[model samples]
Target: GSSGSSGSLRKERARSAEEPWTQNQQKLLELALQQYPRGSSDCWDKIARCVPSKSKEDCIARYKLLVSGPSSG
Candidate 1:
């Protein structure tokens, strides 16, 4: 049933959290940054579509983490 299957879904979520981003994902993020340049209303929506598996919030968060995390120095 759905109850038992949810456990596997949770396990898969946990596994994904531990996995590193792939090269294609990095390139997708870079292209989003170059094309959007932040502060756009639908930037997240458009960017999220570039990688269908990733959510809008996840795409925005990763963009911030990679692009801003370093230049803060």
Candidate 2:
């Protein structure tokens, strides 16, 4: 039989990654996107790494959302 006094099973859950993206986060994210040409496959992956605070999923999501309505000054 297993010992009754085993290591604690309790664990603290991490953040759900659902916090709304913000100012400089967006700034550097979009900049990274532009810097990395779409020709590369891991572009989003690297962009997410470079920005640290976002995942590849959300970055692309916001990219598409922002891409929809754009115009030159």
Candidate 3:
């Protein structure tokens, strides 16, 4: 059977958007936080670049938690 006929054959998609962070990714986030302190323009966006896998929002939320590293909750 050799009849070339391809009109509809694909629909690639993923629903599980949440990919947990790796130590390397989180460490990268920490490095970025120190590199670009608070008040930096579009800081998280740039910081997110450091941790390629995670979205900028991820970095922002992580930063919020990170900022409270030790002293207080």
Candidate 4:
């Protein structure tokens, strides 16, 4: 499953100080990557369900800014 810089990316992620996105939100991210926009509102709403532990606004903004479809160059 490791490819090119992917191994280093894993290592860097392991070594980094960031908290993993919450498991529920992670599932939402995977759903986004797979089904994507098919049920985006539902996925985001599901991600929002993880709050009281992880902030919903963080998830929403992160998904919008970094994880959603890329802009054409």
Please report the candidate that would top TM-score against the real structure.
Answer: 2
lDDT of each: 0.69, 0.75, 0.78, 0.55
Candidate topping lDDT: 3
Per-residue lDDT of candidate 4, residues 9-67 (tens digit): 33566665455666766665555445434354565555555444444445566666565
| Per-residue C-alpha lDDT of model 3 across residues 40-70, encoded as one tens digit per residue | 5586778889987897888887777776678
Error of 3 at 3 (Å): 51
Where model 1 places Cα greater than 4 Å from the true spot, the runs are 1-19, 71-73
Comparison by TM-score, 2 against 3, better one: 2
Error of model 2, residue 10, in angstroms: 27
> Residue 33 CA error for candidate 2 (Å)?
0.8
For residue 35, model 4's alpha carbon misses the true position, in angstroms, by 9.4
> Arrange candidates by TM-score, highest first: which order?
2, 3, 1, 4
Candidate achieving higher lDDT, 2 or 4: 2
Candidate 1 local distance difference test against the native = 0.69
Off by over 4 Å in 4: 1-19, 22-24, 29-46, 50-52, 65-73
- lDDT by residue (3-52, candidate 2, tens digit) is 68777555444654456677878887878888774655587877787677
Error of 3 at 56 (Å): 1.1
lDDT measured at residue 31 in model 3 versus the true structure, 0 to 100: 91
